[PDB]
Design a binder for this molecule. Structure first.
Ligand code: PGT
Ligand code: D12
Ligand code: D12
Ligand code: D12
Ligand code: D12
Ligand code: D12
Ligand code: D12
Ligand code: CL
Ligand code: CL
Length: 398
């Protein structure tokens, strides 16, 4: 946890919105309620105009009507100012310019009152063309996707935000609305001041088919981005698995293990005492240890994997298993990803170099000299597995 405020958003939260506004002197009030869930970066709000008719289009109000509900990924959690200002909350102020038309100025307080997150807003519009897209109610009822750009304002102990909303017009044109935003802590407690990043925002406007009153149902999905997480061998591994249909493979293996005698025999051999001698002797090698530690320090849980290691079938025996898995793997692609990571990943190249090191090859040579290992290979060659070919293929990668 990177802040105390952050812990308030783990679950679903009640939301309340109140707005008072005046646009070209048309005065109105709106109230809304719903729930945010910041884990998923979702929120759901319903609004009603309590004064009678809304003098401006619902879509123009969307941005005005709780960014503390964005989903920040774990690597970005030190960059979330919004949750960090909670519960005391923050002031969010904006100027919104509608191209070729009037502008909105807004001031909102966002903060908890009890268990509820409350957004109270005052809004003033001016200089609107009476025949324009806004007063003329020419906007389609819908919303688009936008990136919301955040940067720290140190002087103000807060953030500066800007973005451009695209409002679709009924004649197929687009009405731009340039947003300039600042957010300020209400409380005197410490807050996170983020590096430059953005919120990816998606929204959808709908109705309650039952609701008779003019209303807007608003659905928002918001996720922070624009800052790369630190990378290591985990991330490289995940990338190879990504290329691999692991579900199919795990199933095929499961099947052979169930219905095939030879596959079961080889598994029995894995708990065999001859095989035990092999594991034991390798585990005894200091250079094997160093290699494991190396993997550990670079993001791999290695020891965890090894110590913790204990009908689609188209084929028969070990070769049947090997062939079925192979038919599945994208060899050319994996091989490409492998070549690429030697270029683009430092950790992966160190890993490669580590394996090619004299230290490591001596682990390999120790193994090659175990007659119990040499016997294991012969046990396979006689079951039809071409080990020598497979062995050469691997030598050739390195
Ligand atoms: C998390 C797993 C850790 C397991 C550690 C396993 C210990 C390694 C034991 C080696 C496996 C034996 C497989 C035999 C392959 C061919 C060996 C060989 O004679 O050739 C080498 C072939 O190259 C290798 O060194 C094989 C590397 C084995 C891959 C083990 C890496 C584990 C990856 C973890 C991620 C060197 O080639 P050369 O042309 O320079 O001579
Ligand atoms: C072949 C490797 C498949 C990975 C399954 C975990
Ligand atoms: C206990 C950690 C040692 C792991 C050694 C694995 C040896 C695998 C050899 C298999 C040869 C095909
Ligand atoms: C299962 C453990 C594999 C160790 C590396 C051997 C590659 C053949
Ligand atoms: C080629 C690899 C054949 C063995 C696949 C076993 C996968 C088990 C998970
Ligand atoms: C994990 C790395 C697999 C490399 C794939 C090379 C295929 C030949
Ligand atoms: C095939 C085994 C290669 C493992 C990848 C090492 C880097
Ligand atoms: Cl401003
Ligand atoms: Cl105002």
């Amino acid at each position: 946890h990177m802040s105390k405020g952050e812990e308030l958003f783990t679950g679903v939260v009640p939301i309340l919105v109140e707005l008072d506004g005046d646009v070209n002197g048309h005065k109105f009030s709106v109230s809304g309620e719903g729930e945010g869930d910041a884990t998923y970066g979702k929120l759901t709000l319903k609004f009603i105009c309590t004064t009678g008719k809304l003098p401006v289009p619902w879509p123009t109000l969307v941005t005005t009507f709780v960014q503390c509900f964005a989903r920040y990924p774990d690597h970005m959690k030190q960059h979330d100012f919004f949750k960090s200002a909670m519960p005391e909350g923050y002031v969010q102020e904006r100027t919104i310019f509608f191209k070729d038309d009037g502008n909105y100025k807004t001031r909102a307080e966002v903060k908890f009152e009890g268990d509820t997150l409350v957004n109270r807003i005052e809004l003033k519009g001016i200089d609107f063309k009476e025949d324009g897209n806004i007063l003329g109610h020419k906007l389609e009822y819908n919303y688009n996707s936008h990136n919301v750009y955040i940067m720290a304002d140190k002087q103000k102990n807060g953030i500066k935000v800007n973005f451009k909303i695209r409002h679709n017009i009924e004649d197929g044109s687009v009405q731009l609305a340039d947003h300039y935003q600042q957010n300020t802590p209400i409380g005197d407690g410490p807050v996170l001041l983020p590096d430059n990043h953005y919120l990816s925002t998606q929204s959808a406007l709908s109705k309650d088919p039952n609701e008779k009153r003019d209303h807007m149902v608003l659905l928002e999905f918001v996720t922070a981005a624009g800052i790369a997480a630190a990378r290591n061998l985990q991330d490289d591994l995940q990338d190879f698995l990504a290329l691999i249909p692991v579900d199919q493979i795990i199933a095929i293996a499961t099947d052979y293990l169930a219905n095939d005698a030879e596959v079961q025999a080889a598994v029995a051999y894995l708990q065999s005492d001859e095989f035990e001698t092999i594991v034991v002797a390798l585990d005894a090698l200091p250079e094997l240890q160093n290699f494991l530690n190396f993997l550990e320090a670079n993001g791999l849980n290695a020891i965890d994997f090894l110590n913790g290691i204990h009908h689609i079938r188209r084929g028969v025996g070990i070769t049947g298993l090997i062939d079925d898995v192979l038919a599945i793997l994208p060899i050319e692609d994996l091989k490409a990803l492998f070549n690429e990571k030697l270029e683009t990943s430092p950790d992966f190249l160190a890993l490669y170099n580590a394996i090619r090191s004299p230290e490591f090859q001596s682990i390999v040579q120790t193994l090659n000299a175990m007659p119990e290992y040499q016997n294991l290979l012969q046990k396979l060659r006689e079951k039809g597995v071409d080990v020598d070919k497979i062995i050469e293929l691997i030598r050739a990668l390195f």
